[PDB]
Amino acid sequence: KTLRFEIVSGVNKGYFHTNSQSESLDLVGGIWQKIAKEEFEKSNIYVSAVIKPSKTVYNQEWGCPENGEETVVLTGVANEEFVDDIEKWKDTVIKLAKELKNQMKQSTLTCEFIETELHYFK
Amino acid sequence: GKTLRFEIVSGVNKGYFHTNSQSESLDLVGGIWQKIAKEEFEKSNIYVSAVIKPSKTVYNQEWGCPENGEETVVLTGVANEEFVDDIEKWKDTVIKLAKELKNQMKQSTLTCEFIETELHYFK
Amino acid sequence: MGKTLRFEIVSGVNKGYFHTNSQSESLDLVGGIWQKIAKEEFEKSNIYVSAVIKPSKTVYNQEWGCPENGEETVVLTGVANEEFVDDIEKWKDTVIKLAKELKNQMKQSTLTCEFIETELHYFK
Ligand SMILES: Nc1ncnc2c1ncn2[C@@H]1O[C@H](COP(=O)(O)O[C@H]2[C@@H](O)[C@H](n3cnc4c(N)ncnc43)O[C@@H]2CSCC[C@H](N)C(=O)O)[C@@H](O)[C@H]1O
Ligand SMILES: Nc1ncnc2c1ncn2[C@@H]1O[C@H](COP(=O)(O)O[C@H]2[C@@H](O)[C@H](n3cnc4c(N)ncnc43)O[C@@H]2CSCC[C@H](N)C(=O)O)[C@@H](O)[C@H]1O
Ligand SMILES: Nc1ncnc2c1ncn2[C@@H]1O[C@H](COP(=O)(O)O[C@H]2[C@@H](O)[C@H](n3cnc4c(N)ncnc43)O[C@@H]2CSCC[C@H](N)C(=O)O)[C@@H](O)[C@H]1O
Numbered sequence: 551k552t553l554r555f556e557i558v559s560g561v562n563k564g565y566f567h568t569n570s571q572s573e574s575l576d577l578v579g580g581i582w583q584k585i586a587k588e589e590f591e592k593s594n595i596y597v598s599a600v601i602k603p604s605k606t607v608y609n610q611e612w613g614c615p616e617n618g619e620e621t622v623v624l625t626g627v628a629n630e631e632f633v634d635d636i637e638k639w640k641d642t643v644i645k646l647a648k649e650l651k652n653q654m655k656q657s658t659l660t661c662e663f664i665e666t667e668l669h670y671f672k
Numbered sequence: 673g674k675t676l677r678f679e680i681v682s683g684v685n686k687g688y689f690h691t692n693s694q695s696e697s698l699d700l701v702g703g704i705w706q707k708i709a710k711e712e713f714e715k716s717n718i719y720v721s722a723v724i725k726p727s728k729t730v731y732n733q734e735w736g737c738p739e740n741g742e743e744t745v746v747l748t749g750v751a752n753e754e755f756v757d758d759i760e761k762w763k764d765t766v767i768k769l770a771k772e773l774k775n776q777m778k779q780s781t782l783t784c785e786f787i788e789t790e791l792h793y794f795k
Numbered sequence: 796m797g798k799t800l801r802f803e804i805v806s807g808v809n810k811g812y813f814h815t816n817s818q819s820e821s822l823d824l825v826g827g828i829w830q831k832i833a834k835e836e837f838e839k840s841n842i843y844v845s846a847v848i849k850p851s852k853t854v855y856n857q858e859w860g861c862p863e864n865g866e867e868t869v870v871l872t873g874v875a876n877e878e879f880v881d882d883i884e885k886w887k888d889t890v891i892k893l894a895k896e897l898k899n900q901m902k903q904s905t906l907t908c909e910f911i912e913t914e915l916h917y918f919k
Contacts, residue, residue: 554909556789558723571695572818575852579864582854590856598855600805600870605698607705608721609713618702623723623748627907644792651794661792662750665673666803667910669891671898679913681847694819730826731845732834740826746847767916774918784916785801785874 553636555643556662557599557624558606562655571603571620578622578654585649595633595642599624624650627668673788676759677750678766680722680784681729682777684743694726694743701745701777708772718756718765722747747773750791800883801874801913802890804846805853807903808867818850818867825869825901832896842889843879846871871897874915 561574568574582599590596602625605618626643633639640663647661684697691697705722713719725748728741736742751762763786770784808821815821829846837843849872852865875886887910894908 554911576864579852579854583857583861583864586854587856596856598853600851600853600868601865602725602849602851602870604723604725605702606721606723607702607709609710609719610706614706616703617699617706618724621723623725627909629907647792648794658793658795660750660752661794662677663673663790663792664677664787664911669894669908669910670905671895671908672905725849727847727849728822728826729845729847730830730833732837732843733830737830740823740830741848744847746849770916771918781917781919783874783876784918786914786916787801787911 552628552630552666552668553640553663554625554627554666555647556664557647557650558604558660559622559624559650559654560606560656561620561622563620565655574620575601575603575622578624581653582624582646582650585646585653589642589646593638593642595639597626597639597643597646599626627666629668629670631670673790675751675753675756675789675791676763676786677748677789678784678786680747680770680773680782681727682745682747682773682782683729683779684745685778686743688778697743697745698724698726701747701773704776705747705769705773708769708776712765712769716761716765718762720749720762720766720769722749750789752791752793754793797877797914797916799875799877799880799913799915800887801872801911802894803909803911804871804894804897805851805907806869806871806897806901807853808869809902810867812902821867822848822850822869825871828900829871829893829897832893832900836889836893840885840889842886844873844886844890844893846873874913876915876917878917
């Protein structure tokens with residue numbers, strides 16, 4: 551019994567001068583790789599992430615483009631093989647989510663935790 | 673955990689909407705969601721935003737599935753306490769939107785799930 | 796209620812073995828492999844485990860072998876629908892069996908398979 555996280559971030563096409571969904575995915579992947587490595591150096595907690603392309607739909611009156619905004623969804627699980635303290639991991643995820651929000655220049659960002667039963671095959 | 677998230681899975685109906693990419697499929701469903709979400713928001717004052725992911729759904733070829741799977745879209749969203757006073761009314765709104773999305777996409781079936789989640793909202 | 800379980804599996808696509816060259820092509824690769832192992836299991840036990848599959852990249856430390864910006868992966872998910880499932884525990888055992896078959900067939904060294912509580916509303 552453990553936790554997974556899910557983060558939803560915009561890609562900020564204009565600030566990063568990207569022009570394809572795959573460039574935005576490679577952008578966020580590289581940014582996560584850098585900040586997860588830094589946090590691992592500090593705390594020995596490495597937060598790996600599975601990143602998926604997406605579009606997020608909300609009201610055009612509140613800033614959404616027609617048909618939605620390009621986004622990345624990042625998800626990962628606390629693996630007991632690597633994580634001894636679920637609370638420290640969860641605090642680490644929250645720090646990383648805030649740092650991703652800052653580096654991606656996002657005005658808002660969601661970070662969820664969901665209970666999950668992990669079967670790890672090695 | 674302290675709120676709910678939903679997940680809906682829908683086909684993209686290339687036979688009816690005559691689309692031919694992952695982009696035009698996300699654009700189609702996203703534009704449709706944006707319209708039905710706004711319509712429900714006007715009626716109920718509950719706006720349900722959605723995160724839309726490209727996918728394929730794999731099932732038995734003898735039940736209609738193409739080889740390697742049917743093109744689909746996965747829609748997710750979370751009830752944010754800053755926007756949602758009443759989680760049961762939000763749940764009923766999501767279900768109403770799911771049935772409406774099924775109708776607009778001309779889907780024979782459609783799944784809608786609710787999962788408990790703990791939301792941290794940074795603004 | 797509709798109280799049930801969903802599974803989530805994360806698999807690499809093993810470009811060194813299958814040599815796919817795009818995300819759409821590795822999605823079709825994993826989709827075909829799942830289709831065939833789900834079919835075999837359905838013929839034997841009458842439990843068909845469908846899967847939604849999503850393209851993705853998985854980010855971990857390059858020190859441990861991750862490519863820059865992430866490794867190409869596929870996420871597979873599915874949910875036990877009480878209209879088809881007679882025994883949720885047998886469904887769960889079947890998912891685990893299929894996940895291990897997928898691991899073997901994709902020649903993955905490691906693979907995660909999660910179960911998450913969910914409430915399914917099924918419209919037909
Ligand atoms: N459901 C809502 N009800 C009422 N008001 C809303 C709602 N959504 C947005 N608003 C209003 O719109 C304005 C923007 O608010 P945001 O919170 O940034 O609005 C959100 C949500 O609508 C939606 N969204 C984000 N994460 C999720 C998720 N996990 N699931 C589903 N939808 C998601 O996408 C928007 C952010 S879009 C990506 C972030 C953006 N590039 C940035 O720089 O901030 C603000 O004025 C809000 O009051
Ligand atoms: N698991 C099963 N076991 C036994 N019989 C099944 C099963 N699935 C389908 N059938 C048979 O096929 C008939 C059609 O059933 P459907 O429910 O439409 O079968 C489903 C599921 O097999 C699969 N699927 C849908 N949602 C999900 C999800 N969230 N996770 C995993 N898989 C998903 O994909 C199919 C729908 S595919 C997209 C919808 C379709 N374009 C349409 O217009 O209806 C049904 O009446 C049964 O006879
Ligand atoms: N988080 C970590 N903390 C510490 N050490 C780690 C961590 N991850 C990997 N390592 C080290 O690297 C070695 C390999 O470990 P793996 O378990 O294979 O490392 C994992 C995880 O880091 C990550 N990953 C996989 N599934 C998930 C998921 N659901 N959510 C988030 N991330 C996921 O991706 C890697 C697998 S990449 C795909 C599988 C691979 N092609 C293969 O053939 O095995 C391991 O022995 C450790 O020494």
